[PDB]
Write a protein that holds these residues in place. Sequence first.
Motif, mmCIF file in Angstrom:
data_model
loop_
_atom_site.group_PDB
_atom_site.id
_atom_site.type_symbol
_atom_site.label_atom_id
_atom_site.label_comp_id
_atom_site.label_asym_id
_atom_site.label_seq_id
_atom_site.Cartn_x
_atom_site.Cartn_y
_atom_site.Cartn_z
ATOM 1 N N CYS A 223 -106.323 25.049 154.049
ATOM 2 C CA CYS A 223 -107.895 25.332 154.608
ATOM 3 C C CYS A 223 -108.293 24.078 155.227
ATOM 4 O O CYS A 223 -107.798 22.940 154.996
ATOM 5 C CB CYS A 223 -108.568 26.188 153.621
ATOM 6 S SG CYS A 223 -109.656 24.706 152.528
ATOM 7 N N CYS B 248 -111.593 27.685 152.094
ATOM 8 C CA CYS B 248 -111.362 28.816 150.704
ATOM 9 C C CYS B 248 -112.656 29.568 150.309
ATOM 10 O O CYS B 248 -113.641 28.671 150.208
ATOM 11 C CB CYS B 248 -110.572 28.324 149.908
ATOM 12 S SG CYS B 248 -108.608 27.913 150.555
ATOM 13 N N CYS C 185 -105.820 27.071 148.213
ATOM 14 C CA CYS C 185 -104.785 26.254 148.870
ATOM 15 C C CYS C 185 -104.549 24.883 148.209
ATOM 16 O O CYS C 185 -105.271 24.576 147.381
ATOM 17 C CB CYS C 185 -105.336 26.161 150.394
ATOM 18 S SG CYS C 185 -106.629 24.895 150.325
ATOM 19 N N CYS D 18 -107.448 22.713 148.122
ATOM 20 C CA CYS D 18 -108.335 22.728 147.383
ATOM 21 C C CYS D 18 -108.058 22.417 145.924
ATOM 22 O O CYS D 18 -109.008 22.108 145.266
ATOM 23 C CB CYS D 18 -108.924 24.183 147.310
ATOM 24 S SG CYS D 18 -109.913 24.723 148.852
HETATM 25 ZN ZN LIG Z 1 -108.717 25.691 150.487
#
Ligand SMILES: [Zn+2]
Length: 1473
Positions: A86, A115, A123, A126
């Motif tokens: 992301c 996200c 992801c 993250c």
């Molecule tokens: Zn993310």
Amino acid sequence: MTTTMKISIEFLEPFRMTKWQESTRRNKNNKEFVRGQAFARWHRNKKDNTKGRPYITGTLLRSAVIRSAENLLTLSDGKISEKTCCPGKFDTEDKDRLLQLRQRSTLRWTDKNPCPDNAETYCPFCELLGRSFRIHFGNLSLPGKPDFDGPKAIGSQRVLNRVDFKSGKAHDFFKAYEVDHTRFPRFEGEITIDNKVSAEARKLLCDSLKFTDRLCGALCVIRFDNLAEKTAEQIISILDDNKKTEYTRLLADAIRSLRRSSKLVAGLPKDHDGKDDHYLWDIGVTIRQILTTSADTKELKNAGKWREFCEKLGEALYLKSKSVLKETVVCGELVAKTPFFFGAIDEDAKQTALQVLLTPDNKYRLPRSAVRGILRRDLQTYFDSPCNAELGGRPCMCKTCRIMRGITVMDARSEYNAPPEIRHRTRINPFTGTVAEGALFNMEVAPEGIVFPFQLRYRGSEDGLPDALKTVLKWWAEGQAFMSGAASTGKGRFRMENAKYETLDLSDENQRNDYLKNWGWRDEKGLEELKKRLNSGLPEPGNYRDPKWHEINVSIEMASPFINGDPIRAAVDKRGTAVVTFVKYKAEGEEAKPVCAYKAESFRGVIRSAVARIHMEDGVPLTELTHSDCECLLCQIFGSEYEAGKIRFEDLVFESDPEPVTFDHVAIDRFTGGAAAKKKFDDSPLPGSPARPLMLKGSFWIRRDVLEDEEYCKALGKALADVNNGLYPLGGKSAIGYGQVKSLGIKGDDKRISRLMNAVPEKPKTDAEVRIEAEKVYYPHYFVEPHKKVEREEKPCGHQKFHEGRLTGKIRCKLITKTPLIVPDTSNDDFFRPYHKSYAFFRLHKQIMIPGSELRGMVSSVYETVTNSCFRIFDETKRLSWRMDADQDFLPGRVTADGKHIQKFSETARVPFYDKTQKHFDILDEQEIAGEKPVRMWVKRFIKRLSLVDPAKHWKRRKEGIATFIEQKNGSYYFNVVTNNGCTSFHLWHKPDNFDQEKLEGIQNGEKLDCWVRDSRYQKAFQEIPENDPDGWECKEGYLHVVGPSKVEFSDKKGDVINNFQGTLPSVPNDWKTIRTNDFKNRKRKNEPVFCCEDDKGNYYTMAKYCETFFFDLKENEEYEIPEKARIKYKELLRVYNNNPQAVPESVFQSRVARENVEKLKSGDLVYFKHNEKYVEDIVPVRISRTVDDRMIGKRMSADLRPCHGDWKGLCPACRLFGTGSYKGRVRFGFASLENDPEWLIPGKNPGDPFHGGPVMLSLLERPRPTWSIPGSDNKFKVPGRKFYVHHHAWKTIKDGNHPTTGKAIEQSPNNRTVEALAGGNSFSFEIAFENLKEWELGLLIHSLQLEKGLAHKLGMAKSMGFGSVEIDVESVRLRKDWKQWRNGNSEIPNWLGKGFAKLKEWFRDELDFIENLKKLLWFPEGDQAPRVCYPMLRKKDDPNGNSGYEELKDGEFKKEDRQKKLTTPWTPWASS
RNA sequence: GUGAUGUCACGGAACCUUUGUUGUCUUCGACAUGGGUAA
RNA sequence: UACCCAUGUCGAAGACAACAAAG
Ligand SMILES: [Zn+2]
Ligand SMILES: [Zn+2]
Ligand SMILES: [Zn+2]
Ligand SMILES: [Zn+2]
């Protein structure tokens, strides 16, 4: 359920650590704390103590990993493994909780939304951020958890400043701790990873760990699996004991200079005779022995250990003294073409004012911060647009800052680790021409030739380097990389060499993964592989811009000696000398080569003075301006305290390798005519002469914009033209002809600056008359009694500018010798010898010449007499003393236990000690002999002698009495005499009365007879009453004054008394108490007992003293105090006794004061003293001793005639013209050069070389005696005047081996000289340079030079014996009308002389008698006129001519009453003959 | 010993100004020592 | 407490004074 991944961080550069701070300041409102959020931190084991340990936070590592992850996701379009990241979430609800917030822009790789806040899966980006602990970063610590005393144990704080681009001057600074990666390379830690995180998150974490290249300010690789103190005390104690503390600082700087090598300890200089009595290193154990035993100590065998020892000892002594992304790698070496100075001050090193930056192991450091600063400055110069960016906030977006954000430079060090050199620097006072107050300092300088490895990485979107960087690197390739400070003195010019550049495309997946796998090839091993791929050279900039600095080459020809002084090097140099020329070091490999150079600071100062003296702004010369916030010419060309200068002078080096020569100088007392005390000195300059001129060539860099300007070019041209005309000598001691610039020439300016550089009246006839009689004998020297008025009215003109109505120029004169001339070369004392010292004539480069200092001294001595002035050289601190004669007021006394009192003994007696009539030495203790313990000795004051016949046929007071004959033995009668009508009956022995004893020869035992008794003075004492005369002895208690067998006569030839000595001459006994009388000077009357002996050292000794003293009848009630004047006079008497060249070579025959080195008066001393009221005037240790004058010799002279003290009492005309310590003189005396081949006094041994001459021997040249011209302590006696030797032709007589006064012979001696003399007729030509001279000053200088037809000068050696008569003719005068125009002044000479004589008339209207007296002393004998001049002998019995000697002259002609008038009247005979 | 979904500190030349210099004839004659005698 | 001198040798100076960091 977690797994631990262990990580290690290895630092490739010194890293930055923060200062420890308590939690109260660890907030967002503290600038210092938040500034160090990207640095390493220091922990405290306890808050109170500093014992701690360095650590790195896990938060900083996490932030770096996140930034690297951003870069990697940008380079991979957001894809990690098979998943797409992301855009990333950086959004915090509570802005306050975050200690910092991101102010850089965030890289973007996708347009998707971040996200969701709550989601089943996240992801990898993250998860790495921490939204999905999952991944916890732990703090990284040193392996093994070691403890250290404090941050200073591991690092040293350094200052980093911020420099304005336009002015070139800093305006702010900050400090940070730098910890060397060599000592603390690795930090270890752990990362805890939860088992539920995805594999892509772990892959991204690993990639970002490998991509993180910097941390805590340093490039990094992240991988996951007593004696000095004691020596100082001893040296300080030695200095304190011997009272040599004034030499401490010189000993602190010299010993520090020994840090270069211990071999310098053996190379330390010795005394002038080669013995170990140097005034510095042999002060003491001695300091030399201390350093020797420290050098070979097992501890200090290592060079680093010895360097540390020397630095600590010197410091102690000084303190006692008080997307598309490409990365281009460029690898090369920066080589120093000039000395460089990266400033960094150690707080614990206070001995040096300016210091250079060094590593902990004493390696020179090229810091990363300085390189980045220089790169930024050069880029801003290229763009012609300064970066107006303030600190903090969002990044600046100028062209320079964009380039600088991709730039990474490795901090560099050098293998070379020799200590830096120390340079002296001063600032001159323009008005006085001397140094300013407090303007003396020293600077550490790193040698040129040091090579630093250089690595530069540029990360950017362009295909390669930007054009600005290409142009800057090409500037650096041309040797125009000005890196360090002190640039205006030609310091810090580097050249980049062996440059290779290579671009790597990080956008390519294969190249990016290769970069990640090998950690970017930034470690030591990785660089080895990377440099194979680099390609030599540098990119060529399409829009290349010319460098802003241009090199101008200077070539100076100087036909004179030169010195740029360095006293500490001389203090350490093997050959003892007061000062030596400056020498610098250059680095070759790991060694240092010393070369002689003209310091860039001195040349810059001279050129700046040349520019400033001729230019003035708004009616004020540039020197007088405060030079603050102004646009004047001097600030534009040279800079000021506000801004950097546009000109930079480098060190000028001499062509070839000229070795320095040694010139001795001595200051001549104007009264005594001899060497002034302590004023003997040496100088070691570089030899230069018209035969072999010194060629000094160098460079200076000038900015292009100045070289284009017409006004600056014209100013520099006029200044350099005045320098070219010899107006500005180089180096020091130019007053005596040093460093005269014969020619200056510059090249490389395209002729912009160089286009600007492009009958004498007859001597007057003299009026002086001197009548000479052939019978009379005249004195070698006379004294000009000076006029009481010495004008101090005028104030000295400054050297800051030329003045209207004042004359500046050069006087060329012909100096002619009228008698033999002697100027010795005293470096070698065996030119005419295979001891007796023999000196060659003064020659420079085998050319006969007269040094400017002797000409200056002679002309100054004459000038101080033409115009009445002060006695420039005079030993005011001397205290005169005389000897007593056998002629009372001195009384016995004992110094009391206090030490400030002396009592008064009423009577003294003579106690026989060294004759064979008593056993006092045997029956007395050491304490009694020393006078410590009182003794009881019988004393007699009158003896009784009697006559059998009534006084007739030949007393005057006789008492008749009855003699009762007792016996007769030994041929001497014995009878008890009763007289005063039976009142006094005494037993006495009697010698046979001639013509009387025969009449009464009849010997009747028990007889009564008539006799007449008389009392005679018999003042003698014995411890036991003698058996011969056991009558009339009084027992008295007192002290024994025993000074030893002191009255002695020591002769090389056998004296009459010792010649008639019968027997064998005994040896000199070691114990003075065992000396016993052996003979009688009057054997007939058995009196004058004497002890004769002979020794090899002192030849014949004749000791005629046999009685010590007995002080009795002490007056305890009567006391006299000792003033401090009496004490200092007694101390002077003691030092004269101990420092006596003519002392008898045997200490047994010296007094106790001289044989035991009595340094002060102490309690219990028995002395003679004369007193006034209740205080003592004079104290002496023996019966006949020395009388010391109360006042200094300078008090015997008028205060107006004493040397000027500066601090302006004022200045006399002669002191004004020749200068003082505080005022620089306005005359420079060059070396006189012999015009032709010399007619010599004595041709040498070899007729092949005619220039050289033969030996000749002078008589003894002895020390002038002030006590002759000053006959005694009377105030009537004054300083008679200034001594001037008369002209006479004794040189003809002394050309043979004939003594001047006697003529018997002149034999060689260890205390006389051999010389070669320039016979009369030798012609020299010399030039005197003068600046800002008044008309009358020039006229009187010309008069002092030429004198008049019938006069002459005296110059050189042995003036008393007829040598050194010279004459001076003024040949030409050149006057500086303007910088471009010069005109002759031979037509202006009569006006000069007339105005000078008018000024003399103004000063002294008709009191010019001194002139005539001086004239009579300058008068040269006419034809058919030969006066006879010589010193007297000691006595008439030593003179074959029969003239009276000094002993016969001190009473008679030159008696004390009329000696001064005889000596102050020129040409006064002392012998009618 | 750091907190954590946000740290351009490789964001900053210890920089500028200052003459190891001013003054000094390698010179030169009378001094050093302490008593002795008073048959 | 008052006179009387007698002896003839011998080198000296060897750096000193000043500034010793400021703006
Ligand atoms: Zn993310
Ligand atoms: Zn900028
Ligand atoms: Zn100015
Ligand atoms: Zn003066």
